[PDB]
Each structure stands twice: as C-alpha cells, then as structure tokens.
Design a protein around this ligand. Structure first.
Ligand SMILES: O=C(O)/C=C/c1ccc(O)cc1
Ligand SMILES: [Cl-]
Length: 359
C-alpha cells in the first residue's frame, strides 16, 4: 500500500487528434493535487491516437506504476485499447472518448463523454422542429462513425428522418470531395457529420464550398473553438451537440453543472485566453471531480495501491449518486456506464464566428 493515489492518463497530444488531447492534458493543472490528504501521483503519456501505444501506456500504468485508476484516451480507437487493458488487469478506467462499453468492458470502465444517443436525440429533435425530412450522413469508417450512423438509423428514423445518403471517410483523409459530390447530388434537407476535432471541420468546409445549402449538424466530438478557427464562415448556422461546459454563463445558478464549468473555464481561459474552453478539457477535469467523490469512499475501507482499493473505487462509482461535474451529473450503475441525462447536453450554433446556445 502507498500514501499516494496513483493515476495514469494516456491522451493524444500528437497527430491529428492533438487538438483533443492537448486541452485534456492542460486541464490537469487545475484538478485536485490531493484527495483526503493523500497526494495524487498523476502520470501522463501521449499515445498519438494509436491503439498500440495506448495499450502499452495503459499496461505501464497498471503494472509498472501500480495505478489505482487509469484514464484515457482522446479518441475512440485507443480508448477501446485502454478498456481492454483495464478490464484484464482489474483497474478502474475512466474513458475520455465515448467508446462502445460492451458487456466485456463494463466491469472496469466508465465514460466521461456523453453517450451518442443523448447527443443524437438533441440533434434529431432540432431537425424535426426545423422541417428536416431527409438526412445524409458523412462520418468516420470506424467504430465512432458506426455508433453515430447506427444511432441516426435507429433513433433518427423513428423520429421521422429518411436517410437518403451515407458516406464514410478515414480520420487521416485530407479530402472528402467524392463523398461530398454524392451528398450534394442527393440534396438531403440536412447532413449529419460524424467526426471529431480537425476532421469534423473538413466536411463542414467541403460541403459549403461544393454548394450544399441544407442544415449541417455536428457531433460533440467537434465542440471546441478550433472548429470555427478551421471552418471559418462555413461554420455559420451549424447545429452542434455539446456538453454544457461550453456555456456555463447561460445556465441558471440552479444547474449543478454551472459551478464546476465556471471553475474549469475561468482557470483554463486565464492561462490560454478567452474562449479557449473545450468539450475535451472538461472530460479530464470532470474525471477528477468523479475521483473527488469516489476516492474518499474507497479510503474508508481500503489502502491506496492495493487491489482492495481498486475494487472499492469500482463499487463507489456505482454507490455514489449524482456526481456533479462540468459536463453533466453522473450516476453510474453496474449496467449504465455513462450515467448521464439531459443535464449533460446543450445545443450550440455558430453566429458571427462564435458559439451561441440555441434556446
Ligand atoms: O474521435 C472520436 O473517436 C471521438 C471523439 C470524441 C471525444 C470527446 C467527446 O466528448 C466526443 C467525441
Ligand atoms: Cl458531487
């Protein structure tokens, strides 16, 4: 057993997904340094978004650092890898990307990002309030893109959407020209883009450049000012699912998410400048808010640096209810590994080069 509580974090600070991981790493400056008087020993590694590196990193944490908790990664593929390692090694894992948490992954993994169906629902609800009958999809040719397309199909169709076109692209692709020509030809009333970070801006710019006039909808993987920096004028009028951390100012004081959002954004934006808030910084910040709640519970009955403590953290994640954080109010169960509800999302648009919450 140790005095310190050991937390390993693998995030993507190089490569195309660096725009997600950099804020996640930077937010660590503003989290707890100590819980219950026990210093937190936080070990941070880059995985480059590569599942192999993330597997290596997670394993370094669980065996070499004897971590009590592991966190990461920034995008879905390395996040699945971390979950594989955490469930084998029996170490609690807080995911920072929204992976499919299957029965094989559920025991030791929970997720900070909003689950795809919560975010889909708020987008499709807007679609059906704004005369959208036909919808096209463009998203990744991998698990994240699949989760979004499957949700559009299942949930979206049931709400009165007809899917008239489906196109995919790979994360590293620098053009989506062919896919966009087909989408523009199909001319759906709206298009849903299933992507994240820099790649989310690519269909935004390509669609507007290549003549698309309909509404464009973006996932919560796009929610940072970076999207507007890259897409520019093509971002105008976009509808975007976001966590509430993007606008704590617009929340009522009664919102449990308001205080922790104001705390993170004030700290982050003091160092990195106005409107540098992000969806992503909030996930690592919120993971520590969760630790603030569950670690004192585990400390009652178990010593840090032991399996008993790992197990106590696992049990506490589902005994401790209504954990307030900047992105939502979490109540995990044995079967619900996201634990979120409507308090975890707002809808954004872009007007005059800035985000505005849609009332
Ligand atoms: O690129 C992915 O696989 C998805 C990234 C993502 C990260 C944080 C979110 O809150 C949503 C999506
Ligand atoms: Cl709380």
């Amino acid at each position: 057993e140790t005095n310190e509580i050991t937390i390993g974090i693998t995030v993507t600070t190089t490569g195309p997904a660096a725009a997600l991981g950099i804020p996640e790493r930077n937010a660590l400056e503003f989290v707890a340094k100590e819980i219950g008087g026990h210093p937190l020993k936080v070990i941070v590694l880059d995985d480059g978004g590569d599942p192999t590196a993330a597997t290596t990193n997670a394993r370094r944490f669980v065996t070499e650092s004897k971590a009590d908790v592991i966190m990461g990664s920034s995008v879905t593929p390395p996040t699945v890898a971390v979950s594989n390692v955490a469930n084998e090694a029996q170490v609690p894992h807080i995911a920072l990307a929204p992976l499919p948490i299957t029965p094989e992954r559920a025991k030791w993994s929970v997720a900070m990002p909003q689950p795809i169906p919560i975010m889909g629902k708020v987008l499709y609800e807007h679609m059906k309030k704004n005369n959208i009958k036909t919808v096209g999809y463009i998203g990744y040719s991998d698990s994240y893109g699949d989760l979004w397309f499957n949700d559009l199909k299942k949930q979206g169709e049931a709400m009165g959407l007809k899917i008239v076109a489906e196109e995919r692209f790979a994360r590293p692709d620098t053009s989506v020209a062919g896919q966009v020509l087909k989408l523009v030809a199909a001319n759906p009333d709206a298009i849903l883009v299933g992507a994240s970070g820099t790649a989310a801006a690519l269909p935004q710019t390509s669609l507007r450049e290549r003549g698309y006039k309909g509404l464009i909808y973006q996932t919560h993987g796009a929610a940072s000012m970076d999207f507007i920096r890259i897409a520019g004028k093509s971002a105008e009028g976009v509808l975007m699912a976001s966590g509430p951390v993007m606008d704590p100012e617009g929340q009522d004081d009664s919102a449990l998410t308001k205080k922790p959002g104001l705390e993170l954004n004030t700290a982050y934006e003091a160092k990195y400048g106005p409107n540098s808030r992000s969806q992503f910084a909030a996930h690592s910040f919120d993971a520590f808010k969760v630790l603030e709640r569950v670690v004192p519970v585990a400390l009652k009955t178990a010593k840090p640096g032991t399996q008993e403590f790992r197990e106590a953290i696992r049990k506490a994640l589902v005994s401790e209810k209504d954990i307030a954080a900047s992105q939502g109010v979490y109540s995990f169960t044995e079967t619900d590994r996201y634990g979120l509800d409507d308090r975890s999302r707002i809808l954004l648009t872009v007007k005059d080069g800035k985000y505005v919450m849609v009332k």
